[PDB]
Amino acid sequence: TTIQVIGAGLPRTGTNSMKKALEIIYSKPCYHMYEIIFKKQSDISIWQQLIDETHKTTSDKRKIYNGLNELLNGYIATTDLPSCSFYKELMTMYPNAKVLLTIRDKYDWLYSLRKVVLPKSTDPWKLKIEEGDQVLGIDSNFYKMTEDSLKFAFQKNHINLDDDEILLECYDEYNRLVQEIVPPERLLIHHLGDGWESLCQFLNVDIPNGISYPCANSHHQMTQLTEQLIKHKSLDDIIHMFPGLI
Numbered sequence: 078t079t080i081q082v083i084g085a086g087l088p089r090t091g092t093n094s095m096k097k098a099l100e101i102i103y104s105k106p107c108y109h110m111y112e113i114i115f116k117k118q119s120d121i122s123i124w125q126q127l128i129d130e131t132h133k134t135t136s137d138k139r140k141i142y143n144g145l146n147e148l149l150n151g152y153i154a155t156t157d158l159p160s161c162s163f164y165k166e167l168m169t170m171y172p173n174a175k176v177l178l179t180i181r182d183k184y185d186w187l188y189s190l191r192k193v194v195l196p197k198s199t200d201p202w203k204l205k206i207e208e209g210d211q212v213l214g215i216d217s218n219f220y221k222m223t224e225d226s227l228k229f230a231f232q233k234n235h236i237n238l239d240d241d242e243i244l245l246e247c248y249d250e251y252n253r254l255v256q257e258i259v260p261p262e263r264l265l266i267h268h269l270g271d272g273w274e275s276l277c278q279f280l281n282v283d284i285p286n287g288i289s290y291p292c293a294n295s296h297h298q299m300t301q302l303t304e305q306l307i308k309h310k311s312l313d314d315i316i317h318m319f320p321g322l323i
């Protein structure tokens with residue numbers, strides 16, 4: 078089992094649904110941000126080390142390749158941050174792996190991003206997200222990894238993350254760059270709502286009979302999850318309220 082599909086799409090572009098879609102298609106696991114959160118929080122420090130490495134005047138590419146390979150051992154694909162930021166390295170490591178770019182309307186994307194991943198520093202909701210995440214054992218270590226990997230994707234060292242206009246332009250530039258660098262034949266651009274047909278055609282497989290395309294991780298659901306984590310202080314006690322998520 079090695080990487081067959083590299084998810085280049087940014088957070089809040091349907092990466093969890095794509096993770097689940099690929100797991101249906103291949104019957105093998107796909108890496109995702111939520112693997113880190115709900116299964117493997119020890120991966121946070123590893124990713125942080127790899128992202129830190131890219132900031133050196135001479136990065137150790139071999140260290141990065143080895144680190145990526147160890148992180149993704151046992152997985153058939155990967156999606157979302159932090160791995161999407163390393164799509165060029167992953168292409169080099171896995172020359173026969175196809176690349177998926179999940180994409181959506183940039184304003185819907187920014188809105189979703191502010192609700193779930195990157196609230197503005199003085200958004201009162203930011204404190205609520207953090208309180209809920211405490212229940213899961215998630216703290217500033219995770220947020221630093223997330224933000225650094227986003228800055229890496231955007232190829233910025235200095236960025237005002239509270240600037241909506243910068244984030245919108247970085248999003249368009251990121252998506253444009255993916256389409257430029259990845260040869261057309263090993264790229265599929267998958268738009269939010271495209272479903273099974275284009276994906277299965279791209280991967281040379283049949284559309285899964287009687288199985289719907291995954292559709293969870295909405296910001297409405299995420300907001301409910303945060304609220305319920307705060308209320309009950311136990312993921313176990315509320316997980317029955319959130320099927321098809323983790």
Ligand SMILES: Nc1ncnc2c1ncn2[C@@H]1O[C@H](COP(=O)(O)O)[C@@H](OP(=O)(O)O)[C@H]1O
Pocket residue numbers: 087088089090091092093094157185189269270290291292293294295296297
């Ligand atoms: N099958 C589907 N059809 C339409 N939207 C989908 C979808 N699957 C996921 N999404 C949307 O993709 C976003 C989550 O992406 P990610 O998994 O990368 O975090 C959510 O957007 P919203 O927050 O606007 O609801 C979610 O609703």
